[model samples]
Target: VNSFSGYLKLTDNVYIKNADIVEEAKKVKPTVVVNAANVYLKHGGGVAGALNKATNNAMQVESDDYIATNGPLKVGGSCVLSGHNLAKHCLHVVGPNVNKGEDIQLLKSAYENFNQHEVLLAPLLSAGIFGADPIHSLRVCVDTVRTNVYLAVFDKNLYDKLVSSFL
Candidate 1:
């Protein structure tokens, strides 16, 4: 699912393989779509190395604007926690490596603002807690959030655990 670009059309039995987020975003007309990929505070720093490599030497306006406008919704950082001008709102979560108490506080802050009628677009569960492995960190996060959530993970083991633990 990394560095892939193209249009994806799913049919009952026919699976057309090539699909890219940028391309799909262009074709699909929707209010919001959740990017459950791992993205960090610094553009192009984490799994999204492509973003960093392309804009590393660019100006702040160029980098920030592009990421905010085109990049996937990012989580787990002060900037995202504070909120971005381009995005509606950013959700911040502290991982296991950080203070759990503080993380819970942050999660509470975000949850307090969320309404049942609103559509929430969040990154993969515990995507920002890279210092901790995804599963263990997500377990702690889910326990604290204590709500129905949409989560994505690259690790099958972690994904399974997420489903079992939550559902």
Candidate 2:
């Protein structure tokens, strides 16, 4: 079920590949995996739900523990956790959920908060149920990175959009 439709270079180092998050994580074996998590860090839907299931609920349990100990992360905030079966570690970032245009900076900050790594892998945060536009999210992510970062996108609409818009 996992396939790369294609990829695009967003900068000298950052790139976006069209593929499932779990599939890319396994294939790339990145230094750090990124989760487009909610403020509560619930693995409820979209990329978060898929990663939660892939890690066999350990991710969710850790997220639950994190919330219990530290409370929910605010929008644009991020934290790292054990990646279990995915990578050595994972970065959980909460992107903005409301006011699309006004929240771009919030989404930008979330992408910017990725801890330094040789290769940082992530998806379009807040572009799913959180309702941020995929193109804008992609721009924010690509525009912020200084190191090698790969963005795995699963949506066909986004795939087509990237091709038409960026390529």
Candidate 3:
């Protein structure tokens, strides 16, 4: 039950709710989607390298596909690099358990490449186990992409409302 703005802003695109992912994807039907999440890679590898690799892969996928997932969809103790398949590409950034600050650098890096009309979708803050609160997460993400990004909240009802309103 959040307020809807006339147009999607970068902050709106970065969300804290899991259900919103699919909703936002459908609304924008973006050519490229960036899934930035803290992925647990195999062999005890840390977050930096794994995230870098994931981001690199996502960049490649965006160049070729109409849409893509940004991070690993499956959750658990295991580490899988299936983010590329989910979105055009998924960027797996790592951070301390319950620490959001660790993700700022990587988020910034991702934002650096965005262009106007480009939408960046994220889950609710604190949505992840080691993630920050939605407000903080949104703040960091919005700040990074403010210059050239539009945000979309992936709420099914919201999307429906948007569509219905137009008609």
Give lDDT tens digits, candidate 1, residues 1-167: 22222312222211122223223323432223223223333433332332223334332344366458766432332223322221233333222224232343333333332233133333333344434445444444444433333332434565455445542
On TM-score, the stronger of 1 and 2 is 2
My TM-score estimates for the predictions, one after another, are 0.38, 0.88, 0.39
Worst 10 residues of 1 by lDDT: 7-16
Q: Between prediction 1 and prediction 2, which has the larger lDDT?
A: 2
**Candidate 2 residue lDDT tens string, 47-144:** 89999999999999999999999998988889889988888899998888764343656877787786466577888778877788787876776677
Candidate 1 vs candidate 3, TM-score winner:
3
Q: Per model, how many backbone clashes are there?
A: 4, 0, 20
Which is the winner by TM-score between candidate 2 and candidate 3?
2
lDDT of 2 at 151: 82
TM-score for candidate 3: 0.39
Best by lDDT: 2
lDDT of 1 at 72: 40
Worst 10 residues of 3 by lDDT: 72-81
